[PDB]
């Protein structure tokens, strides 16, 4: 006979949350990844200096002169950050993150410019030789959709 | 009486036969069991019957997987699911059979 | 992980065959699962087998688990031994890892 | 009455392959050698691999 | 161990000497077997 | 009277039998009990009976 | 954590067997839980057992808890002793930790 204004408006806010659910869920993940990136960076300094001073990429965190323990460079969504031959990889925690990005990671690596180096940011990579890395293809890479426009670099970016 | 095909699976026997009339097939069906069958499961053997891919006599309805409730019973040892089909085949001017072709499936005991 | 020296030449053969062959040569009794993989090609010279094995695993093939008497395995290229007379082998590891990359 | 109980279908059969095929049809794939004695690996005209050694046929 | 009651008498790193109980032509006699470790091997 | 199978589990006995008529099975059933049974649980022994896998 | 010196050779054997064997040699009375793990392969030379044990734990096997008389354990590779004549062992720890990584 009457009461449909309360019933529809409680059910439009319900469906509004369902539509606002995936937007906040990738905005959210995309936010948790933007930090793995900040934690990865700022460690470029150590790595850059080590390379320019010695001409060899730092083998591990201790070589680079950073928390000798990967797990000591963690965060809220970051379970750690390891330096492996100049390549700095950031791992996403398992608690406090999206759902399709946890335990997932990215890498920052550089290239000899000769007198200086240039840095790249993208999906996990392994270093082959002092001037070559390759996709750490394995299935734990943070999905392209969660990576900034500034971190879409490919293993062979120059 | 004689019948046509017999194919088992150590839980049920799907048979294929024929009888003289609405009587000897009634005698035979009474000698076994009578059941209200309900949720049937479809399985690749049915389609292998529609495919002709498993040799038999496609006067027959298919199937051999379901769930059975007893209506009447004469052999304590046999759970006939139902007289799956029955069709009186007349023949032609080349010859008779005139009888009632039929098909039954039955799980025994144990 | 120690054995007689051998030369492994396998031209398009089932890893299950290479395995059995490797058991018929007293390199344990090797047994696979059923469907491990398929067929592989390798050609080794002067390699102890237990190594040519570890090396076969990395090609395509499986990982190995040993019960003790029997071992279970579950789901040209060549091998050459380099003597290192002068340096320690571990000092090469940084540079050698760097050629491999993701290869 | 027999299916409701336990079912085995024993092996006693034929299965004996390369003694049913001619020798010039067979192709040497590889050879293995180590402490377990040397063993040859050979391919059927049906594309199977086999392993055979000194004293075998 | 075993049906012949093979008594453990020595233990090396590679092998184990035992004394077993065989019917040699009708006499019950000692058999001084030495079980080696498991490598690759075959017999009938 | 005689009966067929008897199978127990230290809490209940599932039996299998036969009687002369609507009378001796009534005598036998009266000698025991009579119950309104309600929420039944289905368990892997039922299907082993449908499988014929447990002889009965 | 002190014992006679031993050589452990286990070719595809239940850790429960290695354990019992280790109790039959007066290395405590060892008892597992029931289902601890499975089968392992190790081959040690010149190692006191109580160490070859700590070392067995790290392979696949369990951790150990001692009641005192009995110990409960709950859910080739080789061992070699390196003498360090000249340096202190702790000075190696940085470099040795760095080879292991997550291995």
From TrEMBL, chain B:
<protein>
    <submittedName>
        <fullName>PilN</fullName>
    </submittedName>
</protein>
Automatic annotation (TrEMBL), chains C, G:
<protein>
    <submittedName>
        <fullName>PilQ</fullName>
    </submittedName>
</protein>
<comment type="similarity">
    <text>Belongs to the bacterial secretin family.</text>
</comment>
<feature type="domain" description="Secretin/TonB short N-terminal">
    <location>
        <begin position="28"/>
        <end position="75"/>
    </location>
</feature>
Automatic annotation (TrEMBL), chain E:
<protein>
    <submittedName>
        <fullName>PilP</fullName>
    </submittedName>
</protein>
């Amino acid at each position: 006979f009457t009461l449909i204004e309360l019933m529809i408006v409680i059910a439009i806010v319900g469906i509004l949350a369902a539509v606002a659910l995936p937007a906040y869920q990738d905005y959210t993940a995309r936010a948790q990844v933007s930090e793995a990136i900040l934690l990865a960076e700022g460690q470029k300094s150590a790595v850059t200096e080590y390379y320019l001073n010695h001409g060899k990429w730092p083998e591990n965190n201790t070589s680079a002169g950073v928390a000798s323990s990967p797990t000591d460079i963690k965060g809220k969504y970051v379970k750690e950050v390891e330096v492996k031959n100049g390549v700095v990889t950031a791992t996403m925690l398992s608690s406090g993150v999206n759902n399709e990005i946890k335990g997932k990671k990215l890498s920052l690596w550089a290239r000899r410019e000769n007198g200086s180096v240039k840095w790249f940011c993208g999906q996990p990579v392994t270093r082959t030789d002092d001037d070559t890395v390759a996709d750490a293809k394995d299935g734990k890479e943070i999905d392209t959709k969660h990576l900034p426009s500034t971190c879409r670099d490919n293993f062979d970016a120059k | 009486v004689w019948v046509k095909t017999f194919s088992e699976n150590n839980n049920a026997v799907s048979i294929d036969g024929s009888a003289v009339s609405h009587d000897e097939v009634a005698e035979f069906m009474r000698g076994l069991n009578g059941v209200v069958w309900t949720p049937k499961g479809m399985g690749r053997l049915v389609d292998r019957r529609r495919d002709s891919k498993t040799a038999r006599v496609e006067m027959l309805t298919s199937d051999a997987t379901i769930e059975e409730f007893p209506e009447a019973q004469v052999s304590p040892f046999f759970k006939n699911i139902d007289l799956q089909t029955a069709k009186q085949v007349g023949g032609a001017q080349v010859g008779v059979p005139i009888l009632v072709e039929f098909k039954i499936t039955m799980t025994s005991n144990y | 992980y120690r054995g007689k020296r051998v030369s492994f030449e396998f031209k398009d053969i089932d890893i299950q065959n290479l395995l059995r062959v490797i058991a018929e040569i007293s390199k344990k009794n090797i047994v696979v699962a059923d469907d491990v993989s398929g067929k592989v090609t390798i050609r080794l010279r002067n390699v102890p087998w237990d190594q040519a094995l570890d090396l076969v695993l990395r090609t395509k093939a499986l990982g190995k688990e040993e019960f003790g008497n029997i071992i279970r395995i579950a789901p040209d290229l060549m091998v050459n031994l380099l003597p290192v007379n002068y340096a320690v082998a571990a000092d090469m590891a940084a540079r050698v890892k760097d050629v491999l990359s993701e290869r | 009455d027999e299916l409701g109980p336990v079912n085995a279908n024993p092996v006693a059969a034929c299965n004996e392959p390369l003694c049913s095929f001619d020798l010039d049809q067979l192709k040497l794939v590889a050879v293995v050698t180590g402490d377990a004695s040397p063993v040859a690996m050979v391919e059927d005209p049906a594309g199977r691999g086999h392993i055979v050694r000194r004293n075998t046929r | 161990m075993g049906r012949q009651g093979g008594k453990v008498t020595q233990i090396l790193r590679d092998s184990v000497t035992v004394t077993e109980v065989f019917s040699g032509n009708g006499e019950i006699i000692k058999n001084p077997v030495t079980l080696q470790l498991k490598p690759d091997a075959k017999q009938d």
